[PDB]
Ligand binder design. Sequence first.
Ligand code: CNC
Ligand code: CA
Length: 224
Amino acid sequence: AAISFEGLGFASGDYEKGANLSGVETTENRFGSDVTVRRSTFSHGGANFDNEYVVEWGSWSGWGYSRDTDTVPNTYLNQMSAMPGIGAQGTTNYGIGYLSGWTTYSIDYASAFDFSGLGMFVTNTVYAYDSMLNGDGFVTAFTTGDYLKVTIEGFNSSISTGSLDFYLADYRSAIAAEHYILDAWTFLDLDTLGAVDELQFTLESSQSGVPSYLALDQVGVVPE
Ligand code: CNC
Ligand SMILES: [Ca+2]
């Protein structure tokens, strides 16, 4: 029932960013270059995940998946690993979103899924975590005022069933003791969304240089 990502295959290595997904390719002009854009969708049960891969750049956006256990930071060369180096609830596979440009991306259900009594797991990627914690060429190391959050909104036939915020990293508080960055799979309660045919995800950050990723897993399970 739950989206576990299990029994999605790995054609190459320990993750899928879209380079080996089958999809539809068109030529588009982007940042001044004509490039080949592949739009693909992978499925897990009733749920559909859109992926966009630009062939010439090797860049991607939208959704991918992983079983990666490598937790050594190596900027974008290790971008598909969740901080725990394993999926949630001891499972091998998990999802990755590169929710590029701080806009909205969706999981599309063929049939309504009821989140009553249920939730999902999220955490940070190694790349994003390390960037926020320590800083890089694009990011000032997180201090008072910094944050990374995700808004999760349910829809049913394009009508909102409710909207929830959850902080992947919260340094906003004047009280330093309130500051944290998630390094573990963390349960997010989605009960109030009820029956949805679409879940929308949007990241927001104090700093636009923060790698716009989250790790997600076990979508639609009971609290443990
Ligand atoms: C344009 C752009 C941007 N990108 Co790229 C994205 N999406 N990117 C791209 C494209 C570059 C096109 C080109 N070279 O012609 C494009 C789509 C290929 C790309 C690719 C990537 N990008 C990536 C990321 C994560 C980032 N990108 C941003 C720089 C991110 C930007 C948003 C932002 N917040 O800054 C961004 C939208 C605007 C940059 C810009 O135009 N600056 C103005 C320009 C005049 O200045 P510049 O300093 O010369 O910009 C150069 C660099 O930004 C470089 N570059 C672009 N992305 C990266 C990523 C890294 C790690 C490095 C070292 C350099 C770059 O290319 C620019 C032109 O040469 C980023 C800050 C967005 C974000 N917040 O997530 C972030 C880096 C985060 C970090 N702290 O390390 C990818 C890993 C995304 C992916 N999932 O595939 C990937 C890495 C390279 C690869 N090919 O695999
Ligand atoms: Ca899993």
